[PDB]
Write a protein that binds this ligand. Structure first.
Ligand SMILES: *[C@@H]1O[C@H](CO)[C@@H](O)[C@H](O)[C@H]1NC(C)=O
Ligand SMILES: *[C@@H]1O[C@H](CO)[C@@H](O)[C@H](O)[C@H]1NC(C)=O
Lengths: 48, 49, 49
């Protein structure tokens, strides 16, 4: 029925009605950064 | 009164390996401690910096 | 799980452009390229120095 991952967090499930299999992909997608000259020097900034 | 003088040489190449750096890691504390759970983010917020 | 590995500032193709400029100065200049303007000198005539 249930697929648990290496960290013992569920990721693949069996539908309780269609008896099919679904895969779960958590989505937060992190890692932003703010390239900036000195705020004194200017305001223009670039995201990464 | 007895000395020993070399008469023929030998040029040898050695090797030496030195670490210089290591992989630059970075962990997202909130995303790891309790990720994708807004019901835990508030609880962790008060836990300190 | 938020565990990221960033890439180094110096790529593995820029390192090879230093350690091939640290190796064409020793061959053709000797101990001088690291102490001012590099001065050429025949290779044999530097091994003898
Ligand atoms: C469960 O019920 C739904 C709606 O009645 C139906 O479409 C589905 O085929 C049913 N599944 C099973 C395994 O009975
Ligand atoms: C701030 O910027 C102004 C003009 O850009 C400059 O005259 C001043 O020295 C700067 N001061 C600091 C602390 O960066």
């Amino acid at each position: 029925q249930f697929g648990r991952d290496i960290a013992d967090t569920t990721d693949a499930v069996r539908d309780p009605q269609t008896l099919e299999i679904l895969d779960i992909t958590p989505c937060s997608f992190g890692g932003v950064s703010v390239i900036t000259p000195g705020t004194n020097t200017s305001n223009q900034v670039a995201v990464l | 009164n007895s000395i020993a003088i070399p008469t023929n040489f030998t040029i040898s190449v050695t090797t030496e390996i030195l670490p210089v750096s290591m992989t630059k890691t970075s962990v997202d504390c909130t995303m790891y401690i309790c990720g994708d759970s807004t019901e835990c983010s508030n609880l962790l917020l008060q836990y300190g910096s | 799980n938020g565990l990221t590995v960033l890439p180094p500032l110096l790529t593995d193709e820029m390192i090879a452009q230093y350690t091939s400029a640290l190796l064409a100065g020793t061959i053709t200049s000797g101990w001088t390229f690291g102490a001012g303007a590099a001065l050429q000198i025949p290779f044999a005539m530097q091994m003898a120095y």
